[PDB]
Amino acid sequence: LEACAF
Amino acid sequence: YTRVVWCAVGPEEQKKCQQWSQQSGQNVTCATASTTDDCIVLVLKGEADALNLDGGYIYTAGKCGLVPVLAENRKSSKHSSLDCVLRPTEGYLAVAVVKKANEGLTWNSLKDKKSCHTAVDRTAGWNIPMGLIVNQTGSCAFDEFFSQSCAPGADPKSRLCALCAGDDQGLDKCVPNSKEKYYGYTGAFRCLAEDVGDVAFVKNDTVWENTNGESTADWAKNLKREDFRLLCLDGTRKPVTEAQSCHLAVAPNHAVVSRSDRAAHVEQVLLHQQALFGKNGKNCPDKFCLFKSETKNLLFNDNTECLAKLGGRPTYEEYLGTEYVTAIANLKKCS
Ligand SMILES: *[C@@H]1O[C@H](CO)[C@@H](O[C@@H]2O[C@H](CO)[C@@H](O[C@@H]3O[C@H](CO)[C@@H](O)[C@H](O)[C@@H]3O)[C@H](O)[C@H]2NC(C)=O)[C@H](O)[C@H]1NC(C)=O
Ligand SMILES: *[C@@H]1O[C@H](CO)[C@@H](O[C@@H]2O[C@H](CO)[C@@H](O)[C@H](O)[C@H]2NC(C)=O)[C@H](O)[C@H]1NC(C)=O
Ligand SMILES: O=C(c1ccccc1)c1ccc2n1CC[C@H]2C(=O)O
Ligand SMILES: *[C@@H]1O[C@H](CO)[C@@H](O)[C@H](O)[C@H]1NC(C)=O
Ligand SMILES: [Fe+3]
Ligand SMILES: [Zn+2]
Ligand SMILES: [Zn+2]
């Protein structure tokens, strides 16, 4: 999926 | 009004950053973290402004909203009249390097061999060869492909860290910073030079800069280019003079990223800092050279001639290029 890893 | 806070990854970078800070009269100051991801988080918090990143890390940073500001530009050939700061970047060649004496190792016999990688998540060291290997094997179990590896940033008890050596005390095994003996381009190449690994995933420039007396470091000073071969994707092996026809990918140059709201100030300060400390800089070599660190590529690659302006105010996807971004995305589906 498409989000920031933190 | 305002100082730029650089993020240094590990203590060797922190030391170089501290010399830069002193010489710049605190126009630049330093935060430090143990890994590049932790630096990316310091910037997202606003506790640091910027750092220079491999393309794989630009992907992580860009998914989190950070933007490219200036790119490394190394010595060219064409575009000759153009000033380094205005010349378009050319990419570097990711390659797989082996010893010539390890005869009959090819791209198609890498399974179960020992590999050396710059770190997990970096372009030439990881995203390109592991992306190609997952694709070719039709399997996400890339952690079971090589019998042992050094891939800094992987689980230290796993076989992807089994060849990593840690620091001069033997601590910090596999940490993804320059205190790990086999970290980065020069660490991974050293891992092959010493025959800890059978293959190193690095870039073309690494092999050149650490052979034939181009490096005076103990481990490199006696290496000869002719003792190494590149692995081509068609299964052939070539001399390291042939990287233009025997590479895995062309990578986007390392680049500086920042929060979008500080990108213009970061850019201005960096252009002025490189006029002082850069390749022909007013105070390099007398006082401080921003693009030297005795081959250890600290903060920037030692081969950087300047940080260059980007054309088209690119987004991170535009800067990495659509194809690379899609390859990263595909490989990250495995984990
Ligand atoms: C590993 O395999 C995957 C699956 O094939 C590769 O992903 C694929 O990348 C290609 C080329 O970038 C994409 O192709 C198309 O390019 C045209 C235009 O130039 C564009 O119009 C299309 O939208 C499309 O992107 C393809 O879509 C993409 N496929 C998937 C499933 O995402 C990947 O590049 C391979 N990894 C490596 C390291 O080679
Ligand atoms: C592989 O990398 C090496 C090292 O950067 C490149 O060789 C350098 O290229 C520049 C410009 O062509 C020369 O002026 C330097 O003196 C070379 N350095 C050394 C140590 O030899 C080589 O061109 C690269 N190969 C490819 C195909 O890009
Ligand atoms: O996409 C490429 C490529 C070049 C040759 C062969 C295959 C791919 C590229 C090279 C250099 C660069 N790209 C994308 C933008 C740029 C950079 O530094 O960001
Ligand atoms: C510090 O920054 C200010 C404002 O740009 C400038 O006047 C001064 O020259 C800078 N000095 C150094 C040493 O980087
Ligand atoms: Fe890189
Ligand atoms: Zn190519
Ligand atoms: Zn654009």
Q: Are residues B131 and B217 in the same domain?
A: yes
Q: Are residues B49 and B177 in the same domain?
A: no
Q: Look at residues B308, B252, B273, B251 and name the one whose alpha carbon lies nearest to residue B6.
A: B273
Helix (H, G, I), strand (E, B) or coil at B259: coil
Residues in B touching A4 (Cβ below 8 Å): 44, 63-65
Strand order across the beta sheet in which B304-309 lies: B28-33, B4-9, B50-53, B255-258, B67-74, B304-309
Burial class (CB in 10 A: 0-12, 13-18, 19+), B151: buried
| CA B333, chain centre distance (Å) | 23
**Comparing C-alpha atoms, which of B40, B44, B70, B188 is closest to residue B120?**
B188
Contact A5 B44 (CB under 8 A): no
Annotated binding site of B: 54, 92, 118, 122, 124-125, 185, 254
Does residue B334 lie within any of the structural domains?
no
Q: Nearest residue on chain A to B41, judged by CA atoms?
A: A6
Pairwise CB contact (< 8 Å): A6 & B40: yes
| Count of structural domains within chain B | 2
**Residue B185 and residue B136 in one domain:** yes
d(CA B141, CA B128): 16
Q: Looking at the structure, do residues B250 and B105 belong to the same domain, yes or no?
A: yes
Q: State the Cα–Cα distance between residues B248 and B232, nearest whole angstrom.
A: 7
With an 8 Å Cβ cutoff, are A3 and B63 in contact?
Answer: yes
What is the distance between the alpha carbons of residues B313 and B242, in angstroms, rounded to a whole number? 34
Could you tell me if residue B100 is inside a domain? yes
* Separation between Cα atoms, residue B77 and residue B56, nearest integer Å: 26
Is A4 an 8 Å CB contact of chain B?
yes
| CB of B73 sitting under 6 A from ligand 3 | no
Residues B33 and B169 in one domain: no
Q: Bridge-partner residues for B194, per DSSP?
A: none
Please state, in angstroms and as integers, the Cα–Cα distance from residue B302 to each residue in B26, B97, B228, following that order.
23, 20, 22
Vertex B100 angle, CA B224 and B226, to 5°: 30
Query: What range defines the domain where residue B169 resides?
Result: 74-254+317-327
Same domain? B246 vs B268 = no
Length of chain B: 335
Residue B101 lies in a domain: yes
Closest CA of chain A from B270, distance in Å:
27
